[PDB]
Amino acid sequence: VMNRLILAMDLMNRDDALRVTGEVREYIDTVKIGYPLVLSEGMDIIAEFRKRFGCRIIADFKVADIPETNEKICRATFKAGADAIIVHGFPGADSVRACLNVAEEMGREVFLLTEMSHPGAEMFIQGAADEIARMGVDLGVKNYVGPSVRPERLSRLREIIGQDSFLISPGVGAQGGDPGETLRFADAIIVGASIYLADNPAAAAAGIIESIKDLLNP
Amino acid sequence: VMNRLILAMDLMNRDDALRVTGEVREYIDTVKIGYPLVLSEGMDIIAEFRKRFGCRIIADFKVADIPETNEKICRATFKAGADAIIVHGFPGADSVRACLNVAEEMGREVFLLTEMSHPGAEMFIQGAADEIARMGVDLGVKNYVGPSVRPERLSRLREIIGQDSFLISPGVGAQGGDPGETLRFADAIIVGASIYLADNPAAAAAGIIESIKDLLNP
Ligand SMILES: O=c1cc(O)n([C@@H]2O[C@H](COP(=O)(O)O)[C@@H](O)[C@H]2O)c(=O)[nH]1
Ligand SMILES: O=c1cc(O)n([C@@H]2O[C@H](COP(=O)(O)O)[C@@H](O)[C@H]2O)c(=O)[nH]1
C-alpha cells in the first residue's frame, strides 16, 4: 500500500469520485470503495477505477449474510474486479469461510472486520471482538480491519492476529484517529472525508503523508 | 403482503430475474431484492422491478456500517425506489437510528434483522438477539426479520416486539423451515430458491400457498 494510506472514496457521484481520486492519485495506489458510491453509480465504477488509475480496490461491503448468499456476493464482487472484500465476523465462521472459499478459488483477498470505530460498536461488537479475531485466525484469515479510534483494542487485535497478518484501520481524520499512533499497530490507515471533502484533496493527503513520513518504508 | 409470501429474488441474471418474477406475479406483490442481484445488475433493477410489476421492494442490504455511512446507504437505496431496507442490529443503536432517520425523513420503512437462520448465527448473534430486539423496540422499530428455522426464537422474538410489529421470516423452502409453523409467529414468509430454481416457479409458489391456505387473510 503506497504511503500506507488507503483512500475511503465515499463520494456518491461518479464524476466527483473520479475527480477527487484523480487529484490524489499521486499519493495513493489503494482505494476502498463502499456502498455509498457503488449503490449510487453501479459496480462498473470499480473497473473504471482500475482503468483510470491502475490502483488496488478494496470492496468495503461489510459482507454479513448467510453462507450461501455471502458466496454470491463475493463471486459477484470479484467478477467486477475487486482485489479484496471486507467481511463481517459477527455472523460466525461459516459465513466467513464462504467468503474465504470464493476468494481463494479466485486468488483474491478477504479482510475480516473484527471491531468498529463508532460508539454503537460498544453495544455488541466490542464484547465479541476477541473471539471474532481468534475465529479469523483459526480460519486462516490473513487480513484484518480494526478501528483507529481506540488504539488499545488495535493492540489487542495485533496480539491475536500476529505480525504476519495485514491490518488496515479506518477512523483517521474525520473520526479523530491519529495517523501516527494508528500505524504503531496498523499496516495502513484508511482516510475518507478528511481528504475527499476538504478544499484541497492533494494537500490534505500530502499533509497526512508528511505527518507520518518517519513511518513510511518499506 | 399478498398471500403472506415474499419472493427472495436472488437470481444474479437480470433476464432470469425479470422472468421468474414475471411468472409468479399472480401470487406475490412483494419482492425482497438483495446484493446478489443488485451487485450484478445495478440499483436501477429496483425501479425496473417496480415499473414492470408494481410490487413493493424490500432492499435486503443487511446494512451494517457506522452511522455516517449507513445514512448514505439508506439515501442511495431509497432514492432508487426501495420501499424498505433491512438493517443489522449488531452494530448497535446509533447505526440503526441512522437508518431509521433517513427512512422517516423519506417516508420509508426499516426492517431490523435481529437473528439469523444459519448455523454460524449461534456463534455471536444468538447470544445478543434478545437485547438487539429490545434495542429495536426502544428505537421505535416496527418491522423485524427473524429466522423460520428456529421456531422457538421466533416465538421469543414476537414476545419482545409485540403483535403491533410486522415480522417477516426467511429460511423457508431451501433451508428447511415450514411455512405453516413459521406464520404462527411471522406475518409473512420469505422464500427464495425453492421457488426461483424450480422448473415451474408459478407452480411452486402455488404449492406453498395452497398449503398455506388456512392462514391467508386478512
Ligand atoms: O469501523 C469502521 C469500519 C469501516 O469500514 N469504516 C469505514 O471507513 C470509512 C471512514 O471514512 P471517514 O474517514 O470520512 O471517517 C467509511 O467508509 C466507513 O464506512 C469506519 O469508519 N469504521
Ligand atoms: O437469517 C436470514 C436472513 C436473511 O435475510 N436470509 C435471506 O433470505 C433469503 C433466503 O433464500 P432461500 O429461500 O433460497 O434460502 C436469502 O436472500 C438470504 O440471504 C436468510 O436466509 N436468513
Strands of chain A (E only): list them: 5-9, 30-34, 56-63, 84-88, 109-113, 143-145, 166-172, 188-191
In sequence order, what are the beta bridge partners of B111? B86, B143
Q: Which three cell numbers stand for residue B104?
A: 422517516
Residue B72 annotated as catalytic? no
Q: If you take atom 6 of ligand 1, which residue's CA is the nearest one?
A: A170
Q: What CA–CA distance (Å, rounded) separates A91 from A80?
A: 24
Label residues B71-89 b or e (16+ Cβ within 10 Å = b).
bbbbbbbbbbbbbbbbbbb
Count of beta carbons in the 10 Å neighbourhood of residue A200: 12
Answer yes or no: are the C-beta atoms of B56 and B84 closer than 8 Å: yes
**Which amino acid does the sequence have at B26?**
E
C-alpha A58 – ligand 1 centre gap (Å): 13
Kindly list the distances between the CA atom of residue A66 and the CA atoms of A71, A96, A140, B43, in Å, as whole numbers in the listed order: 9, 9, 19, 22
Q: What is the CATH number of the domain that holds B31?
A: 3.20.20.70
Secondary structure class of B178 (helix, strand, coil): coil
Q: Which helix (H) or strand (E) holds A171?
A: strand A166-172
CB contact under 8 A, B120 and A43: no
Count of beta carbons in the 10 Å neighbourhood of residue B154: 24
Count of beta carbons in the 10 Å neighbourhood of residue B193: 15
Secondary structure class of B189 (helix, strand, coil): strand
Residue B71 forms contact with A (CB below 8 Å): no
Q: What CA–CA distance (Å, rounded) separates A30 from A9?
A: 10
Q: What CA–CA distance (Å, rounded) separates A42 from B38?
A: 9
Q: Write out chain B residues lying below 8 Å of A116, CB-based.
A: 66, 91
Radius of gyration of chain A (CA): 16
Q: What CA–CA distance (Å, rounded) separates A62 from B67?
A: 14
Q: Which three cell numbers stand for residue B32?
A: 425482497
Q: What CA–CA distance (Å, rounded) separates A55 from B188?
A: 45
Q: What CA–CA distance (Å, rounded) separates A18 from B6?
A: 38
Q: Which residues precede gaps in chain A, with C-N > 2.5 A?
A: none
Residue among B139, B140, B132, B138 at smallest CA distance from B114 = B132
Q: Which three cell numbers stand for residue B55?
A: 410490487
Domain that holds residue A134: 1-218
List the catalytic residue out of A51, A62, A79, A213: A62
Determined by: X-ray
Q: What CA–CA distance (Å, rounded) separates B29 from B26?
A: 8
Residue among B115, B114, B145, B99 at smallest CA distance from B6 = B145
State how many domains chain B has: 1
Secondary structure class of B72 (helix, strand, coil): helix
Residue among B23, B43, B44 at smallest CA distance from B35 = B43
**Which amino acid does the sequence have at B57?**
I
Entry resolution (Å): 1.7
What is the distance between the terminal CA atoms of chain A, rounded to a whole angstrom?
A: 10
Beta-carbon contacts of B50 under 8 Å, excluding residues fewer than 6 positions away, are: B57, B81
In sequence order, what are the beta bridge partners of A8? A32
The gap from C-alpha A24 to its chain's centroid, in whole angstroms, comes to: 18
Answer yes or no: are the C-beta atoms of A185 and A218 closer than 8 Å: no
Strands of B79-165 (E only): list them: 84-88, 109-113, 143-145
Beta-carbon contacts of A88 under 8 Å, excluding residues fewer than 6 positions away, are: A62, A63, A64, A95, A113, B64, B88
Residue A123 forms contact with B (CB below 8 Å): yes
**Which amino acid does the sequence have at B136?**
G
Identify how many contiguous H helices and E strands chain B contains and give both numbers.
10, 8
**Which amino acid does the sequence have at B122?**
E
Q: What CA–CA distance (Å, rounded) separates B77 from B59?
A: 7
